[PDB]
Write an enzyme that holds these catalytic residues in place. Structure first.
Site, PDB file in Angstrom:
ATOM      1  N   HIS A  38       5.720  14.802  15.535  1.00  0.00           N
ATOM      2  CA  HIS A  38       5.788  15.495  14.247  1.00  0.00           C
ATOM      3  C   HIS A  38       6.700  14.798  13.248  1.00  0.00           C
ATOM      4  CE1 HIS A  38       8.297  17.879  17.115  1.00  0.00           C
ATOM      5  NE2 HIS A  38       9.190  17.884  16.141  1.00  0.00           N
ATOM      6  N   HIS A  61      16.246  13.172  11.113  1.00  0.00           N
ATOM      7  CA  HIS A  61      14.832  12.901  10.921  1.00  0.00           C
ATOM      8  C   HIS A  61      14.503  13.202   9.466  1.00  0.00           C
ATOM      9  CE1 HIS A  61      15.145  17.204  11.649  1.00  0.00           C
ATOM     10  NE2 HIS A  61      14.185  17.283  10.739  1.00  0.00           N
ATOM     11  N   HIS A  84      11.192  14.509   6.601  1.00  0.00           N
ATOM     12  CA  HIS A  84       9.888  15.084   6.284  1.00  0.00           C
ATOM     13  C   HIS A  84       9.406  14.364   5.021  1.00  0.00           C
ATOM     14  CE1 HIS A  84      10.795  18.547   8.972  1.00  0.00           C
ATOM     15  NE2 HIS A  84      12.025  18.260   8.593  1.00  0.00           N
ATOM     16  N   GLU A 142      10.961  19.669   1.940  1.00  0.00           N
ATOM     17  CA  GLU A 142      10.843  21.029   2.427  1.00  0.00           C
ATOM     18  C   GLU A 142      11.497  21.986   1.432  1.00  0.00           C
ATOM     19  OE1 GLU A 142      11.847  20.949   6.729  1.00  0.00           O
ATOM     20  OE2 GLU A 142       9.646  20.953   6.823  1.00  0.00           O
ATOM     21  N   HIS A 149      17.093  15.275   7.141  1.00  0.00           N
ATOM     22  CA  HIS A 149      17.841  16.320   7.816  1.00  0.00           C
ATOM     23  C   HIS A 149      18.746  15.726   8.875  1.00  0.00           C
ATOM     24  CE1 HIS A 149      14.580  19.470   6.721  1.00  0.00           C
ATOM     25  NE2 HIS A 149      15.428  19.213   5.740  1.00  0.00           N
ATOM     26  N   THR A 164      13.044  24.491  10.632  1.00  0.00           N
ATOM     27  CA  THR A 164      11.806  24.456   9.850  1.00  0.00           C
ATOM     28  C   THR A 164      10.580  24.031  10.661  1.00  0.00           C
ATOM     29  OG1 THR A 164      11.983  22.213   9.036  1.00  0.00           O
ATOM     30  CG2 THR A 164      13.118  23.928   7.744  1.00  0.00           C
TER      31      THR A 164
HETATM   32  N1  LIG Z   1      13.673  20.521  10.433  1.00  0.00           N
HETATM   33  S1  LIG Z   1      15.059  21.123  10.996  1.00  0.00           S
HETATM   34  O1  LIG Z   1      15.228  22.476  10.530  1.00  0.00           O
HETATM   35  O2  LIG Z   1      16.141  20.213  10.797  1.00  0.00           O
HETATM   36  C1  LIG Z   1      14.831  21.223  12.724  1.00  0.00           C
HETATM   37  N2  LIG Z   1      13.925  21.940  13.322  1.00  0.00           N
HETATM   38  C2  LIG Z   1      13.946  21.838  14.694  1.00  0.00           C
HETATM   39  C3  LIG Z   1      13.147  22.405  15.660  1.00  0.00           C
HETATM   40  C4  LIG Z   1      13.306  22.183  16.998  1.00  0.00           C
HETATM   41  C5  LIG Z   1      14.318  21.348  17.445  1.00  0.00           C
HETATM   42  C6  LIG Z   1      15.144  20.733  16.536  1.00  0.00           C
HETATM   43  C7  LIG Z   1      15.019  20.937  15.178  1.00  0.00           C
HETATM   44  S2  LIG Z   1      15.904  20.354  13.807  1.00  0.00           S
HETATM   45 ZN   LIG Z   2      13.795  18.795   9.469  1.00  0.00          ZN
END
Ligand SMILES: NS(=O)(=O)c1nc2ccccc2s1
Ligand SMILES: [Zn+2]
Ligand SMILES: NS(=O)(=O)c1nc2ccccc2s1
Length: 257
Positions: free
Chosen positions: A61, A91, A93, A103, A116, A195
């Protein structure tokens, strides 16, 4: 299971993760005129001098740059936070074109991408325990716009063709995440969630006001990654962002006048 495709995207997630319709979901739109300056907020303390990156992983993803979080090396403190939060991974998006990808939005503006940096509260001992708590994580969000190249991003860009497909990883030691920050640490903050599934409501969001600039060539390389595994039908890893969710009974606070 879930993804960002035509049949398993964000609008479907609630069927397996009912918290998707919860009271503190992320991301959100940041209405700059409604966010209140809070004089009680502190300067953020981003302490990454001793960061130890280890590995980069295509997880199907996004791609995660993973850090050694076995002790307090790279940590986030201050701002809205109490205590110490350890960097575990970062990571991004991003979109299929420059006009979408972030986001969070700012007065409904979408940026080309969003970084993030994910940190967990050391008072809970491990990440898995932290995500079960309302103050378990702090995610530092940074917008990307397309313009001049970001020199500190290029090492990330250049390893991507070695992790094209889901489940591939590569060594990624000695990367300095300070090279991904903007000049100013002015920020907005609000209580929210992960998210992606499991969408847990465990995050203090800290979203920087100043975007970083990356080049078109850099973001184009993000868009050559694949959601699919090796040998499977090619699905470009693009538009891996969740849209803004209802703010409900939440206040977004600004660290700056
Ligand atoms: N995209 S985030 O909110 O930074 C994020 N979502 C998730 C979901 C599962 C495991 C780690 C993360 S870190
Ligand atoms: Zn994220
Ligand atoms: N509710 S979901 O995790 O987003 C999900 N969507 C789909 C679509 C087809 C097959 C399995 C699943 S699982």
């Amino acid at each position: 299971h879930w993804g960002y495709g035509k049949h398993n995207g964000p609008e479907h997630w609630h069927k397996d993760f009912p918290i998707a319709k919860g009271e503190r979901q992320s991301p959100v739109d940041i209405d700059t005129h409604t966010a209140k300056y809070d004089p009680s907020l502190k300067p953020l303390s981003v302490s990454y001098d001793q960061a130890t990156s280890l590995r980069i992983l295509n997880n199907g993803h996004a791609f995660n740059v993973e850090f050694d979080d076995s002790q307090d090396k790279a940590v986030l403190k201050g701002g809205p936070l109490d205590g110490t939060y350890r960097l575990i991974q970062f990571h991004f998006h991003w979109g299929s074109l420059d006009g979408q990808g972030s986001e969070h939005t700012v007065d409904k503006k979408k940026y080309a991408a969003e970084l993030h940096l994910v940190h967990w509260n050391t008072k809970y001992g491990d990440y898995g325990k932290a995500v079960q708590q309302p103050d378990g994580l702090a995610v530092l969000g940074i917008f990307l716009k397309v313009g001049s190249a970001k020199p500190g991003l290029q090492k990330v860009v250049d390893v991507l063709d070695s992790i094209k497909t889901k489940g591939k990883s590569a060594d990624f030691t000695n990367f300095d995440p300070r090279g991904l920050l903007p000049e100013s640490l002015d920020y907005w903050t609000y209580p929210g969630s992960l998210t992606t599934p499991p969408l847990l409501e465990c995050v203090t969001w800290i979203v920087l006001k100043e975007p970083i600039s990356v080049s078109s060539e850099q973001v184009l390389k993000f868009r050559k990654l694949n959601f699919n595994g090796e040998g499977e039908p090619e699905e470009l890893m693009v538009d891996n962002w969740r849209p803004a969710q209802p703010l409900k009974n939440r206040q977004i606070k600004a660290s700056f006048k």
